[PDB]
Write a protein that binds this ligand. Structure first.
Ligand SMILES: NCCCCCC(=O)O
Length: 90
């Protein structure tokens, strides 16, 4: 409402989040990215629907985690952290 600070309820499962980055890990690997060819969660994944992704880099909760998270690239290694989605609280 009003300013409507991009937030989510419980785990933003059904609702669609607008954030596309992890709290402090890094940016979110493009779901339809080629590096995710048939990988954990992606838009090019045969389960893209269940994944809850799409042609973008938004954060999601394909596993049903807390706040929609997203992949992140670390020191020569891959990762994924909670996205910086400002909860609604109350
Ligand atoms: N719960 C999301 C897991 C995402 C996997 C990312 C990785 O393999 O680093």
């Amino acid at each position: 409402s009003e300013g409507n600070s991009d937030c989510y309820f419980g785990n933003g499962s059904a609702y669609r989040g607008t954030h596309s980055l992890t709290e402090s890990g890094a940016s979110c690997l493009p779901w339809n990215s080629m590096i995710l060819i048939g990988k954990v969660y992606t838009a090019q994944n045969p389960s893209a629907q269940a994944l809850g992704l799409g042609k973008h880099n938004y954060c999601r909760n394909p596993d049903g985690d807390a706040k929609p998270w997203c992949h992140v690239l670390k020191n020569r290694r891959l990762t994924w952290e909670y996205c910086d989605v400002p909860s609604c609280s109350t």
